[PDB]
Amino acid sequence: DTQDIEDYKRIVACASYKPSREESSSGSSHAVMDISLPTGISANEEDLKALVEGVDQLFTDYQIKDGHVILQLNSIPSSDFLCVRFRIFELFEVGFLSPATFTVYEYHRPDKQCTMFYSTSNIKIQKVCEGAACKCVEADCGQMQEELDLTISAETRKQTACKPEIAYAYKVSITSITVENVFVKYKATLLDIYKTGEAVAEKDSEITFIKKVTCTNAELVKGRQYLIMGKEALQIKYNFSFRYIYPLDSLTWIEYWPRDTTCSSCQAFLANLDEFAEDIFLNGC
């Protein structure tokens, strides 16, 4: 995967050799890594030199044939991962392009060629799947609110609550947490509503929330009552059964007014929550 390092883009390509039951756990014979660069993407000649021409050499050789960067070594550690990192400037922009390849194989066997796709430009579209059906969403890393009380003013809350972007603002308690291929599903049983979205959920209904793993502010407690101000109702409709996944954009609100009461200042937060609560419930802003 490509990193932005702080112009200079920069690649961190890594490998390991399968250790076959027959094979030694040592690692492979000399293998070659062939990193195809997207059209009009030069490399940092110096960076390459650095890992071959340093006598504690990661590699034995380098070269640039056409689009390809061709590194070579004695063996690839099966113990763990081994990585080359090198810079690639966008020496030019070709308007339109396609993904290039990262292919690495044993020299004396062309058939054991593992080719992986990758893109030179970074963005986001997550392919999110439910019930054997997939439908994409895009994730802004979520931000968690600081605690139950920050002298949150009713008004502000309802500003973002009735902010044109928001769709559904309502109180859920969590029940279940999964962690599956980039995302983190949250099965939550649903308490009273406040503001209903397009895709209208039922009352003691169970919704599914996703925010993917890259996020660490948004870290939710099992079975702990959260108010969430969810922006999107994502109604992927697969197989004539229609479900909702809700996402957790940065935009999304998170706050936890736990049931425990009279525990000092905790009671005070309840005065505003219920305030904002009854306010929007009665009047739609």
Task: Let me know if 187 is exposed, middle or buried by CB neighbors in 10 A (0-12, 13-18, 19+).
Answer: middle
Which DSSP category does 272 fall into?
H
Q: Are 11 and 35 in contact (CB under 8 A)?
A: yes
User: Which has the closest alpha carbon to 216: 143, 147, 138?
Assistant: 143
Q: What experiment produced this structure?
A: X-ray
User: Which has the closest alpha carbon to 172: 216, 144, 217, 205?
Assistant: 205
Using CA atoms, how far apart are residues 230 and 140, in angstroms rounded to an integer? 13
Residue range(s) occupied by CATH 2.40.50.120 in the chain: 131-285
Return the CATH number of the domain spanning residue range 1-130: 2.60.40.690
Q: Which two tokens stand for residue 76?
A: 């690839």
Q: Are 144 and 254 in contact (CB under 8 A)?
A: yes
Q: Are 17 and 81 in contact (CB under 8 A)?
A: no
Residue range(s) occupied by CATH 2.60.40.690 in the chain: 1-130
DSSP bridge partners of 247: 210
CATH topology for 131-285 is: OB fold (Dihydrolipoamide Acetyltransferase, E2P) (2.40.50)
